[PDB]
Symmetry: C3
């Protein structure tokens, strides 16, 4: 339900995350080695967090109304950003641990990621239309850099590893590039930006993106020989 | 002194934390060795945070009214959660460093702790009654997970340590298990939950729990041979 | 344009931070060595964050009104604290890495820093007049601690290093001591505290302090042979 029917995607999203989390848990019951176990922990925590955010939004807590200087009223699920603030660095940690990136490089990307999510949240909450777009632009620029550094810096880090590790890395990297690049488009075409689509469409789009980026990614990671 | 006299416990809690903090600082003045000193820093910082949160609540900052969909109006001291968000991980850090747990395991427990505190805050703040209990359940589940991993993972980590360190670990573990397990019950019986007791009783109970969990714990930790 | 003209300093602040960030980026383009690279990443991220913060304030995001129990109504840019919450630990990381301080000493300063910024935020937002000054006093006390530890603990850590590093460290330390010490004074003389000056003057003062503390500090750090 929700404001305009979009709660269905919230509920499905919850269940989806919850199913993936349970699958991951079920997958790691028989694992002793600490590094593999670390990948389990991170990758279980990610959809746990996303399931809880989704559930909060289904119930109406992740939701505030914002009145723009436009007179335009926008229905804002801000719990997304809460979710994103924690799960995107964890996803970066996951693949960075896969890649054998240094503490330094992971920290760098996480810093950039955090900047990206917070300036996104400002873009979403600000009443000034020009501010909305300026911050969407700042956030997207930071995203472009994050994705470049992911490719160059983590790719270099993974370049001396075995074939399975490099292969899994490349798969996960491409999942990040494609799915993560779509989020700013989604923001632009949904109600928060140009409102070409409404809340229902936008919510469906982010449900699909989140499911791919968290459960799809998690599946690909946790099944690899690379983490083993 | 608050909405219904509970400020007196807010005042006593403040004073108690402060006195604990002062004792610990005074206890640590001559400490030179870095690991021991690290236990002092963490264990001083905890009641400092809690003293500051209690004082903010005493002044009414960090108190909000929440009107539930039931119509019931609840007086919510949310700054407690801010306090907990940082202090419960520090407590876990404290016992982890005592146990000789790895960076990974500690991070894991901090993760699940964070999940517990945040979902508990959602439980406290959401207007939808079924949601309040759903989130309380999610949070309590995480608590059980957390406590189990504390016993099994940190207990296994400490199992190769000397007798003093094992015995201290067992004391601190038992403090956490007993006191921390009561918090969700307190929430349930207090005004955010079943409202079997009013704001005053609940504030008293959390004051006692907080004091044992921070000052009692701290005292037991810092007086041990184990950290020297 | 601001509430009372202070927008001019928000804009000039935005621009100076952005130019500092771009200068640092230009300067670090060929840097290959990992350790110097870290200094670049941190020192570039600091004015990035501060620039985004300034821009948010310029657009009126991050500005609330607080009605005090006195009846005074205060125009409070709270986004500053958001800014400070992240940049001040990073500044501390930057100099700690320069000083060769341990993870524990750095974490310690970051923890007391965090305490300082959050208690200052409480001071800024609380409606209770006595509480404003109580938290300002708490915060300033922790600042004094932080500065002493910075001098004693980072000074000892840096004491075994080469002369270039000790000298650069002493330069950066003195910038922190002098500029950081002025902030609580600025809070006290400005509209949040005794109101001896208005929002325009206070905003100007913080702009100058922030520019020195971030771009001046970053310049001195990044141009030193010590980090290369
Ligand atoms: C009003 C909002 C204005 C924008 C606020 C943006 C706040 C988010 C930005 C940054 C927060 C994340 C900071 C991340 C800080 C990362 C520090 C780092 O690079 O560590 C490297 C070491 O591990 C190497 O050994
Ligand atoms: C009367 C108000 C009581 C509640 C507010 C208390 C605020 C905390 C008290 C003073 C501010 C400074 C807190 C500073 C907290 C940082 C931890 C620390 O104190 O380290 C001390 C070192 O010597 C350890 O080795
Ligand atoms: C106008 C208000 C906003 C000003 C800042 C907006 C642009 C911020 C810049 C980058 C976004 C990420 C935050 C800064 C993160 C910098 C990390 C880095 O590795 O920098 C590499 C560069 O030096 C190129 O090699
Ligand atoms: C806004 C909040 C954003 C953060 C949210 C939580 C995400 C934490 C991610 C990484 C933990 C930091 C430590 C990263 C360690 C990387 C692994 C590593 O460095 O391994 C080699 C090292 O030598 C082994 O001790
Ligand atoms: C709401 C208030 C939040 C307040 C901030 C909470 C987050 C604390 C973050 C890091 C501290 C980690 C504990 C410090 C671990 C190292 C301690 C140490 O060894 O310190 C040595 C130094 O030389 C002498 O202090
Ligand atoms: C993200 C949700 C809010 C979290 C707020 C946390 C506040 C700081 C308290 C604990 C963190 C300690 C650092 C992270 C965990 C690593 C612990 C560690 O550094 O352990 C070192 C030890 O040497 C290994 O054996
Ligand atoms: C939107 C409202 C509802 C939101 C509900 C979710 C809110 C965040 C919950 C938990 C924070 C998780 C922080 C995780 C910090 C890192 C922990 C970690 O990395 O643990 C594994 C370790 O690295 C190797 O074992
Ligand atoms: C008021 C009540 C509130 C709810 C409180 C619920 C009880 C606490 C939950 C879990 C801790 C107990 C964990 C039990 C398992 C300990 C770990 C373990 O048994 O590990 C294997 C063992 O070593 C093989 O001999
Ligand atoms: C109130 C919210 C809680 C407080 C929020 C604070 C946010 C800090 C963010 C970035 C700085 C992170 C600095 C982490 C420094 C850890 C110590 C370290 O990395 O030391 C390495 C050593 O120099 C070689 O091994
Ligand atoms: C699991 C959560 C994920 C993968 C979240 C990804 C979010 C982004 C890549 C955010 C993108 C944004 C921009 C880069 C522009 C501003 C709007 C945002 C926040 C949607
Ligand atoms: C020093 C502060 C401490 C030890 C606080 C501990 C708090 C908890 C263990 C929280 C418990 C709760 C649940 C597990 C269910 C939701 C209600 C909470 C947040 C009180
Ligand atoms: C880049 C920003 C910097 C370096 C800001 C530092 C800010 C402080 C050291 C603030 C100190 C304050 C007090 C000590 C008292 C409370 C008022 C504050 C927050 C301004």
């Amino acid at each position: 339900l929700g404001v305009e029917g979009e709660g269905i995607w919230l509920a499905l999203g919850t269940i989806g995350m919850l199913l993936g989390m349970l699958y991951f848990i079920a997958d790691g019951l028989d694992v002793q080695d600490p590094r593999q176990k670390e990948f389990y922990v991170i990758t279980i925590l990610i959809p746990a967090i996303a399931a809880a955010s989704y559930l909060s939004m289904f119930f109406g807590f992740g939701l505030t109304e914002v009145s723009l200087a436009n007179g335009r009223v926008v229905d804002v699920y801000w719990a997304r950003y809460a979710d994103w603030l924690f799960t995107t660095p964890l996803l970066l940690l996951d693949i960075g641990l896969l890649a054998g990136a240094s503490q330094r490089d992971i920290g760098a990307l996480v810093g950039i990621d955090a900047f990206m999510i917070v300036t996104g949240l400002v873009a979403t909450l600000t009443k000034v239309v020009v501010a909305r777009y300026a911050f969407w632009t700042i956030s997207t620029i930071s995203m472009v850099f994050l994705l470049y550094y992911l490719v160059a810096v983590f790719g270099e880090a993974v370049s001396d590893a075995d074939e399975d590790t490099r292969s899994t890395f490349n798969a996960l990297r491409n999942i990040i590039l494609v799915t993560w690049a779509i989020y700013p488009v989604a923001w632009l075409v949904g109600t928060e930006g140009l409102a070409l689509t409404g809340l229902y469409g936008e919510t469906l789009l982010f449900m699909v993106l989140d499911l791919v980026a968290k459960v799809g990614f998690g599946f690909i990671l946790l099944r690899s020989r690379a983490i083993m």
